[PDB]
Amino acid sequence: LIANQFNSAIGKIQDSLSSTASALGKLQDVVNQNAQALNTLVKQLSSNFGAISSVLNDILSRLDPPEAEVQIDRLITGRLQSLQTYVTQQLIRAAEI
């Protein structure tokens, strides 16, 4: 009797995992959170942060050396704070994991 109950329980586990996909929300949430963090990190590159243009070769090709540093400084500060925000949140999430 115990052997039969155990076998039936294993079969029901197999059927439950086959049917219901949401069972692995705990793992899927981690994957989604990491992908979302990287998506935002990448999307930050398309932001001016106040400079004339969010692409660095246009600033380098358009403006003179004595003037480029203002725009480049704005971009560097913006991207640096973005990268620090990403790293800090990754450190916290890694502590949880």
Partner: protein, 48 residues
Amino acid sequence: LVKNKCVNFNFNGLTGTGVLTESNKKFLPFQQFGRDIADTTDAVRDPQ
């Protein structure tokens, strides 16, 4: 244009460095560029 080698390319002021390869992106006329998520050119149309 030399293909399949790292080059510094300049198409109508659009500059960059990369490997230029023949492409299967079937984009319709009056379109020139392509774009990725980060809004940096991924495919481009030869002016000549």
